[PDB]
Design a binder for this molecule. Structure first.
Ligand SMILES: *[C@@H]1O[C@H](CO)[C@@H](O[C@@H]2O[C@H](CO)[C@@H](O)[C@H](O)[C@H]2NC(C)=O)[C@H](O)[C@H]1NC(C)=O
Ligand SMILES: *[C@@H]1O[C@H](CO)[C@@H](O[C@@H]2O[C@H](CO)[C@@H](O)[C@H](O)[C@H]2NC(C)=O)[C@H](O)[C@H]1NC(C)=O
Ligand SMILES: *[C@@H]1O[C@H](CO)[C@@H](O[C@@H]2O[C@H](CO)[C@@H](O)[C@H](O)[C@H]2NC(C)=O)[C@H](O)[C@H]1NC(C)=O
Ligand SMILES: *[C@@H]1O[C@H](CO)[C@@H](O[C@@H]2O[C@H](CO)[C@@H](O)[C@H](O)[C@H]2NC(C)=O)[C@H](O)[C@H]1NC(C)=O
Ligand SMILES: *[C@@H]1O[C@H](CO)[C@@H](O[C@@H]2O[C@H](CO)[C@@H](O)[C@H](O)[C@H]2NC(C)=O)[C@H](O)[C@H]1NC(C)=O
Ligand SMILES: *[C@@H]1O[C@H](CO)[C@@H](O)[C@H](O)[C@H]1NC(C)=O
Ligand SMILES: *[C@@H]1O[C@H](CO)[C@@H](O)[C@H](O)[C@H]1NC(C)=O
Ligand SMILES: *[C@@H]1O[C@H](CO)[C@@H](O)[C@H](O)[C@H]1NC(C)=O
Ligand SMILES: *[C@@H]1O[C@H](CO)[C@@H](O)[C@H](O)[C@H]1NC(C)=O
Ligand SMILES: *[C@@H]1O[C@H](CO)[C@@H](O)[C@H](O)[C@H]1NC(C)=O
Ligand SMILES: *[C@@H]1O[C@H](CO)[C@@H](O)[C@H](O)[C@H]1NC(C)=O
Ligand SMILES: *[C@@H]1O[C@H](CO)[C@@H](O)[C@H](O)[C@H]1NC(C)=O
Ligand SMILES: *[C@@H]1O[C@H](CO)[C@@H](O)[C@H](O)[C@H]1NC(C)=O
Lengths: 420, 167, 64, 49, 148
């Protein structure tokens, strides 16, 4: 069939009607980014000429072709640790939460380290590690930062975010009650903090439910980690192809070098060896080029992950859809095999009403404009309310300002302005 | 069938008609001894890399040697998951990483002086005095200037392919 | 007479031990679901072509 | 290390200079014990020719 | 070491050019790396083969060099795009992006030129001294809840 692209939905646009949300929902989304790739290393001499003096002596005629591949692979291996360090090692100190989790009703037990595990990872991290799953001179170097150390960095970043908001990023971690931190997070998106305080229990319950939904998704949707599984699969496929290339003849009478050396005199064995050297060197060059391109892609992903960490976890993002759909409040990092997982907490309007609006109200001939928010009418009375949450207030001189007169503004309506 | 490797005992149940085993890479994994019907694993002989861990020559000519991905057998010897590290003293005290080794282990030249190896710290531990009714608000400030250096361009080289190949 | 060969006619292509692996090999195999001539020995022993190899099967109760 | 970097001064760090490879000590040649002999005895030691 | 990010680029380009030039000394299977020594010693039926071997080796060397230069150029282009983004959103304006323009609350930045690169001096506001205060989300007066 021809694909749709989504449901058709016209907007009830008119010159005097505004829809302002009356309720909201707190959602948590999961963004998974690759950070590093397996630090492979290939011994070009042993790969091409394993335990063969004649092959090595012929290979020496190609100069630096061998060692420059070791150099390129070393550069890749180094930049993988640079990427991990830049993404996770963004906090100068290792922070820890207090023993009493009095965070205003917000339950973080599923993202904070579990002291009972052999490795102090969170429950979600344990779920992530349970979802993501030669001797020819090809070796794998270990990462500099072990999974435990990555978990410790994510723990420090999470404890900092929870106990000090964004203050630990700029300078020292300044303790603040979590509810007040959320009050700032709400003010940062144009929602007055009294909305948070009056609805603190509802917001905490919505957050806890969103976290539970994240747990169910990670525990049930295997495809969630495809971005990391594809990288692991690509590296495994590249190594399997490189090793399998040793079985190819490349025009020689046999792929086995010892069978050529034991059967042909030097005047012919040297030719057969040169053919095998050419084929295996071309195979290594192809492998290294593919690894350099993939490494550049991984580096770009790691740079994006570090940018998100800094402008999403350590601060609050004003960038639309940078940190999930909705108005960004806060994010929590989680580690994953060869990558990072971000839990983005966003404010999403949930319920709306159709209100009549006006750009300004006339009182004594003066044109009154809102200082913050917009003017709304329920059909009989005009009110002023914040743009992102319906909260009608009486229109007063402390809510509006005067500029010009009634003869200039298009669409100005008549009402009264209360003078306290 | 010839090759080089370490022959060890195995628990692989070969069928009576099967003589050789292979791994995913199509290399030989195990063979059945033609005289005594037992299965022997073939593990290629230990190999890897030699890395030298050293402070700069402006300080000392003492070095430590890391044999990558080997056991401290075939080679003041410290076994790590990065390989067999020879010449570095293992210190229980953690410090900031100086010369990285791998798998969480770093080495440095410290105190009479010698090269030491240790598990890196990652920074000082600092709990936050969090409570539901306490806020820390700065009373003073400092203006700092930092330096960020970024590459913008690279040398505009040009190679005459004809003159280079066939001058 | 003809019958359905289903999935019969698969043999070990070599003497190599493999486990927990899917191995792709090209050799002379009996095509799946191909037709094989059905002969009877009741109440018929002709000479058949050999071509490039022959698959043979029999069912017994008295070792005829 | 100095030769690897083509310098008489080595900066602080870790450098890869040479590949370690264990050498074999002896060869192992295996064939089955008794396959099948050939009756050369009854040809040379034949009672009558 | 402050300029390592630029010195490493200069060193990588110098190393690539030195490797490319050094590759001319390799035989690639020929009797001699010097083309004139082949031409002056072998008849065309053999000189053409030795030349084809040298051409294959040197062409492969050039292809490797060019591929490495294209990858490095892509990395430099990404760095230059980042530098231009920082210039626009750091020098010309004021950045609200955390740790985009240095640690702390960004105020202003000043560009400085450097060989094959750009240097940014980021001026940030960093809290220096703090006190422990008791807080409250709101204050009651006559039963009304007052928020800041
Ligand atoms: C705003 O939405 C929330 C849920 O998104 C509402 O909370 C629900 O209220 C109903 C009562 O009609 C209960 O049965 C549900 O169990 C509540 N759910 C949760 C998660 O609290 C809330 O009442 C809405 N507020 C308004 C003013 O409509
Ligand atoms: C935070 O959530 C966790 C679970 O996500 C709660 O732990 C559960 O506590 C109940 C008892 O109240 C036990 O019966 C469950 O088995 C626990 N589950 C797990 C996974 O530990 C924890 O109590 C919650 N804390 C708060 C303050 O709400
Ligand atoms: C629009 O809002 C006004 C202000 O609240 C409403 O007027 C009040 O209506 C209630 C009944 O719902 C009365 O008890 C109050 O005395 C009214 N106050 C005033 C100042 O009139 C008005 O009813 C609302 N209109 C609609 C359609 O809901
Ligand atoms: C809003 O109120 C003003 C007066 O407060 C209205 O202005 C009147 O407009 C008519 C039509 O031209 C004039 O005849 C009157 O003299 C005006 N009033 C005054 C005091 O000069 C205006 O029309 C009203 N607008 C609406 C939409 O009701
Ligand atoms: C805020 O900090 C600045 C320095 O960061 C203080 O200035 C110093 O004040 C002391 C007096 O105790 C002088 O001896 C120093 O020479 C000053 N240094 C500079 C650079 O001015 C300043 O006094 C602090 N303000 C408060 C209120 O504590
Ligand atoms: C506003 O009116 C339009 C009329 O078409 C309706 O479709 C829309 O649902 C209304 N808004 C709400 C929040 O009900
Ligand atoms: C809105 O548009 C209608 C025509 O669709 C017009 O009659 C009405 O006066 C307009 N109101 C304002 C405030 O512009
Ligand atoms: C030696 O060189 C290093 C450069 O890594 C420098 O940090 C150190 O201070 C130098 N020491 C002396 C004594 O010059
Ligand atoms: C190294 O060898 C010792 C004994 O020779 C053994 O106990 C140990 O497990 C080995 N370690 C590895 C990593 O093979
Ligand atoms: C570190 O301390 C443990 C005791 O917890 C001890 O057994 C070990 O030998 C110490 N390390 C060294 C290098 O002495
Ligand atoms: C084999 O014979 C059956 C019926 O006996 C027939 O349905 C089938 O199509 C035949 N196979 C082919 C390849 O024609
Ligand atoms: C070959 O050696 C095995 C192992 O001892 C033995 O059991 C077997 O009988 C030998 N072969 C013959 C023909 O005796
Ligand atoms: C606030 O109190 C805690 C109590 O543990 C203390 O560690 C901290 O230094 C205090 N804050 C300041 C700015 O002194």
């Amino acid at each position: 069939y021809t694909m749709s692209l989504g449901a058709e939905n016209s907007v009830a646009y008119s010159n005097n009607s505004i829809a302002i949300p009356t309720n909201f929902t707190i959602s948590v989304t999961t963004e998974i980014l690759p950070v590093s790739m397996t630090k492979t290393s290939v011994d070009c001499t042993m790969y091409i000429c394993g335990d063969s003096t004649e092959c090595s002596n012929l290979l020496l005629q190609y100069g630096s072709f061998c060692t420059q591949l070791n150099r390129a692979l070393t550069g890749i291996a180094v930049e993988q640790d640079k990427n991990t360090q830049e993404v996770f090692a963004q906090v100068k100190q290792i922070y820890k939460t207090p023993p009493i989790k009095d965070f205003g009703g917000f339950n973080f037990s599923q993202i904070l380290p579990d002291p009972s595990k052999p490795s102090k990872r969170s429950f979600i991290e344990d779920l992530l590690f349970n979802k993501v799953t030669k001797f020819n001179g090809l070796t794998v170097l270990p990462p500099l930062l072990t999974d435990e150390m990555i978990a410790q960095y994510t723990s420090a970043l999470l404890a900092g975010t929870i106990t000090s908001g964004w203050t630990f990023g700029a300078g020292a971690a300044l303790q603040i009650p979590f509810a007040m931190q959320m009050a700032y997070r709400f003010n940062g998106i144009g929602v007055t903090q009294n909305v948070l305080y009056e609805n603190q229990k509802l917001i905490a319950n919505q957050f806890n439910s969103a976290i539970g939904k994240i747990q169910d998704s990670l525990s049930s949707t295997a495809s969630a980690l495809g971005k990391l599984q594809d990288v692991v699969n690509q590296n495994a496929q590249a190594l399997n192809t490189l090793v399998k290339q040793l079985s190819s003849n490349f025009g020689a009478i046999s792929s086995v070098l010892n069978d050529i050396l034991s059967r042909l005199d030097p005047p012919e064995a040297e030719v057969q060896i040169d053919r095998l050297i050419t084929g295996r060197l071309q195979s290594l060059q192809t492998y290294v080029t593919q690894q350099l391109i993939r490494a550049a892609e991984i580096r770009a992903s790691a740079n994006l992950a570090a940018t998100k960490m800094s402008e999403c976890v350590l601060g609050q993002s004003k960038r639309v859809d940078f940190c999930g759909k909705g108005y960004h409040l806060m994010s929590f990092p989680q580690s994953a095999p060869h990558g990072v997982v971000f839990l983005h907490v966003t404010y999403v309007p949930a319920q709306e009403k159709n209100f009549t609006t006006a750009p300004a109200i006339c009182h004594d001939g003066k044109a009154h404009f809102p200082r913050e928010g917009v003017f709304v009418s329920n059909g009989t009375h005009w009110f002023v309310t914040q743009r992102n949450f319906y909260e009608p207030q009486i229109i007063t001189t402390d809510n509006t300002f005067v500029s010009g007169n009634c003869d200039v503004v298009i669409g100005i309506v008549n009402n009264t302005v209360y003078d306290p | 069938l010839t090759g080089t490797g370490v022959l060890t005992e195995s628990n692989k149940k070969f069928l009576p008609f099967q003589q050789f085993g292979r791994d995913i890479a199509d290399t030989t994994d195990a063979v059945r001894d033609p005289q005594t019907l037992e299965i022997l694993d073939i593990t290629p002989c230990s190999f890897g890399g030699v890395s030298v861990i050293t402070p700069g020559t402006n300080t000392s000519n003492q070095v430590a040697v890391l044999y990558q991905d080997v056991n401290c057998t075939e080679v003041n010897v410290f076994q790590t998951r990065a390989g067999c590290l020879i010449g570095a003293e293992h210190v229980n005290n953690s410090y900031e990483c100086d010369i990285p080794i791998g798998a969480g282990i770093c080495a440095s030249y410290q105190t009479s002086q010698s090269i030491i190896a240790y598990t890196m710290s990652l920074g000082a531990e600092n709990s936050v005095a969090y409570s539901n009714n306490s806020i820390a608000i700065p009373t003073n400030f400092t203006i700092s200037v930092t330096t960020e250096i970024l590459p913008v361009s690279m040398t505009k080289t040009s190679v005459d392919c004809t003159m280079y190949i066939c001058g | 007479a003809y019958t359905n060969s289903f999935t019969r006619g698969v043999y070990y292509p070599d003497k190599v031990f493999r486990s927990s692996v899917l191995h792709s090999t090209q050799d002379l195999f009996l095509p799946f679901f191909s037709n094989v001539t059905w002969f009877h020995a009741i109440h018929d022993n002709p000479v058949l072509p050999f071509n490039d190899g022959v698959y043979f099967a029999s069912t017994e109760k008295s070792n005829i | 290390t100095k030769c690897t970097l083509k310098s008489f001064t080595v900066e602080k760090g870790i450098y890869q200079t040479s590949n370690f490879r264990v050498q074999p000590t002896e060869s192992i040649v295996r064939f089955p014990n008794i396959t099948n002999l050939c009756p050369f005895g009854e040809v040379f030691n034949a009672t009558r020719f």
